[PDB]
C-alpha cells in the first residue's frame, strides 16, 4: 500500500565522501550552508504556493491517460517477468498506477494549469524505477 520507498544504502565514495565531508567541513565553519550556487525558498513564501497549487486539481488528458495504461501492462509485464525473488518487487498492482496517475496529478499541481502533461506523467514513472534499482550499487 506504499507508493514509494527510497533505499538509503550508503557505499563510501572517496570523491563523494570528501565533497560531503567538505559540506561537513563547511559547517560548523559557518551558519550559512547553501552556495555555488543556490537560493532555497523560505517556507512561508514557499508554503503559500503549496495550497495555492493545491486549489488547481489538474484534470487528466486522455492522451497521457491511455499511455499510462500502456506502460502499466508493461510494468504489469516486466515486474512479473522478474518472477522469483531477486531484485523484485512485483506485481505492479493498480494501486501504484492508481497513485502514479495521482502523481502526475500531484506533479501537475506544481505546473498548476491542470493540463497533465505526458512528460508530467512520465516524470513520475522516472521516479518509480529510481525508488528501486539502486540496489545494484
Amino acid at each position: 500500500r506504499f507508493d514509494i520507498l527510497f533505499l538509503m544504502l550508503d557505499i563510501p565514495s572517496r570523491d563523494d565522501d570528501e565533497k560531503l565531508a567538505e559540506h561537513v567541513t563547511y559547517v560548523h565553519m559557518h551558519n550559512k550552508q547553501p552556495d555555488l550556487d543556490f537560493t532555497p525558498v523560505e517556507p512561508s513564501k514557499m508554503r503559500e504556493y503549496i495550497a495555492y497549487a493545491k486549489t488547481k486539481r489538474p484534470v487528466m488528458s486522455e492522451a497521457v491517460n491511455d499511455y499510462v495504461v500502456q506502460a502499466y501492462i508493461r510494468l504489469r509485464q516486466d515486474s512479473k517477468r522478474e518472477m522469483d525473488s531477486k531484485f523484485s518487487f512485483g506485481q505492479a498492482t493498480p494501486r501504484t498506477l492508481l497513485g502514479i496517475i495521482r502523481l502526475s496529478q500531484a506533479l501537475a499541481k506544481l505546473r498548476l494549469a491542470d493540463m497533465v502533461d505526458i512528460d508530467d506523467v512520465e516524470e513520475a514513472l522516472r521516479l518509480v524505477r529510481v525508488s528501486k534499482e539502486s540496489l545494484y550499487q
Binding site: N65, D66, I73, T93, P94, L97
Partner: protein
C-alpha cells in the same frame, strides 16, 4: 442526531425485478458496481446475504442459512474494498483486521464499568458479529486462540462463555467472510492447493467456499481494467432497492426444494468425491439461497447446476501433500530399513541424526529434508518403531 416497513408499490417492483431475467446477474453488477470483473466472486456475495434457510425441525437442527466463504488471492486485488463496501451493506455487519482482533475480543469482555466501580460483562466481536455479515482480515494471520472460538461458531453456531464469574453459552448466528492473503505472497503455479493457502485442513475444509483470486496478466484485461480505473478521472444498477429486497427476501421467503432438486444433487456429489458431505451440506445451503432469490417458496431444479459449479469454481482452482498416498510412509519404511541395516551393520542400534541426514536426504529426491525426517522420526517414535536416544543421535526401537 443526523422494523423497516416497505411501501406496497416497489414491493411489486421487486416482483417485477424478480420477473426480470438477469436479476441473478444484474443485481450482481449492482452488488459491487465500483468493483471490476470477479463476477463469480460477486455471485457468491450475491448468494450469502440470501444464503440458506432455518431448519429447527421438531427439535434441534438449526443448520441455519449461515454460510461463510473466505476470499483469497493476489494482494491489492481490491478484495478488501468489497468487505469495506459490504460492511455498509449489512444491517448488522462486522469487520476486523487480523492480529488486532483477539479471541477475547470476539466474546465476553467482562471489564469493570469503572464509573460504578464494578466489572461489567460485554459481548465480544462475534456476539455483535451475531446476525448479519462479518468480514475477516488476515484470517491466515489470526491467532490460534482465534478460529477456535470460531470453530465453536462454525459448528454450534453459538458462543459458550464459562469464563470469569458466570457461565453463558450464547448463540451467534451470523454470516462471515474472511479476507485471505497468500504467504507467497503469490499463490504460485501448481503447488499443493491447501498447503498454499496455509491454515489447517480442518479449518479450511469447513469453510462454505473458497474463491481464489489470481491474475493472468490479460492485456486485454488490465488495460480496460485500467480503463475502468481510467474512470474517475471524472466526473441497470439498483442501489437501495435491492437492500430492501435484502430485507424483504428474508422473512417473507421460506423456500422448500421439494423432490426434483434432490435427484440432481446426488449425481454431482458422486463425481465430486469422484469432496465432502460438508460440500453436500453447502450444495443444499447454496442453491436454496438461490431459492431465496426470485421469491421462490420452492427451489428450481436448475440452479444446483451452477450451485455445484460455484463449487466447481473453487474446484477449477484446485488444478493448481499429506493426502498423496505414502509420502512419509515410504520414507519411514526406508528410514526404518536404513536404521535397521545400520543396526545390523553398525555396532549400535543407533546412528547420528546428522548421519541420518547424510544417509537419508542426500541419496534421492524421495529422501526428505532433515526437519521432515525428524517429523517422520517423531511419528515413528509415537509408533514405538524408534528411540530418540537424545538430541545427539538416533536409535532403533528395542525388542
Amino acid at each position: 442526531v443526523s422494523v423497516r416497513q416497505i411501501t406496497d408499490q416497489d414491493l411489486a417492483k421487486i416482483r417485477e425485478v424478480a420477473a426480470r431475467e438477469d436479476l441473478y446477474s444484474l443485481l450482481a453488477r449492482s452488488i459491487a458496481p465500483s468493483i471490476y470483473e470477479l463476477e463469480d466472486v460477486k455471485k457468491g456475495i450475491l448468494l450469502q446475504l440470501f444464503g440458506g434457510t432455518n431448519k429447527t425441525f421438531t427439535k434441534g437442527g438449526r443448520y441455519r442459512g449461515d454460510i461463510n466463504i473466505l476470499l483469497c488471492g493476489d494482494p491489492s486485488t481490491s478484495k478488501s474494498q468489497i468487505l469495506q463496501y459490504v460492511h455498509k451493506i449489512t444491517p448488522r455487519g462486522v469487520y476486523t483486521s487480523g492480529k488486532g482482533s483477539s479471541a477475547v475480543g470476539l466474546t465476553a469482555y467482562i471489564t469493570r464499568d469503572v464509573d460504578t466501580k464494578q466489572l461489567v460483562l460485554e459481548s465480544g466481536a462475534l456476539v455483535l458479529s451475531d446476525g448479519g455479515v462479518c468480514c475477516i482480515d488476515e484470517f491466515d494471520k489470526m491467532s490460534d486462540s482465534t478460529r477456535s472460538v470460531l470453530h465453536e461458531v462454525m459448528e454450534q453456531q453459538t458462543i459458550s462463555i464459562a469464563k470469569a464469574g458466570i457461565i453463558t453459552t450464547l448463540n451467534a448466528r451470523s454470516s462471515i467472510l474472511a479476507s485471505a492473503n497468500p504467504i507467497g505472497s503469490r499463490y504460485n503455479p501448481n503447488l499443493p492447493v491447501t498447503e498454499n493457502i496455509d491454515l489447517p485442513p480442518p479449518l479450511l475444509s469447513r469453510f462454505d467456499l473458497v474463491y481464489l483470486v489470481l491474475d493472468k496478466v490479460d492485456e486485454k484485461n488490465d488495460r480496460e481494467l485500467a480503463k475502468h480505473l481510467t474512470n474517475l478521472y471524472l466526473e441497470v444498477l439498483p442501489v437501495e432497492f435491492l437492500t430492501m429486497y435484502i430485507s424483504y427476501a428474508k422473512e417473507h421467503i421460506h423456500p422448500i426444494i421439494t423432490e426434483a432438486a434432490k435427484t440432481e444433487l446426488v449425481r454431482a456429489y458422486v463425481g465430486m468425491r469422484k469432496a465432502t458431505t460438508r460440500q453436500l451440506e453447502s450444495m443444499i445451503r447454496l442453491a436454496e439461497a438461490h431459492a431465496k432469490m426470485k421469491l421462490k417458496n420452492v427451489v428450481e431444479l436448475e440452479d444446483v447446476q451452477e450451485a455445484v459449479r460455484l463449487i466447481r469454481s473453487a474446484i477449477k482452482d484446485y488444478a493448481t501433500q499429506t493426502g498423496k498416498s505414502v509420502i512419509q510412509r515410504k520414507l519411514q519404511e526406508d528410514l526404518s530399513r536404513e536404521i535397521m541395516n545400520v543396526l545390523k551393520d553398525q555396532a549400535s542400534d543407533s546412528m547420528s541424526f546428522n548421519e541420518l541426514i547424510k544417509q537419508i536426504n542426500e541419496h534421492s529426491q524421495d529422501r526428505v529434508e532433515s526437519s521432515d525426517i525428524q517429523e517422520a522420526l517423531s511419528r515413528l517414535q509415537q509408533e514405538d518403531k524408534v528411540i530418540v536416544l537424545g538430541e545427539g543421535v538416533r536409535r532403533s526401537v528395542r525388542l
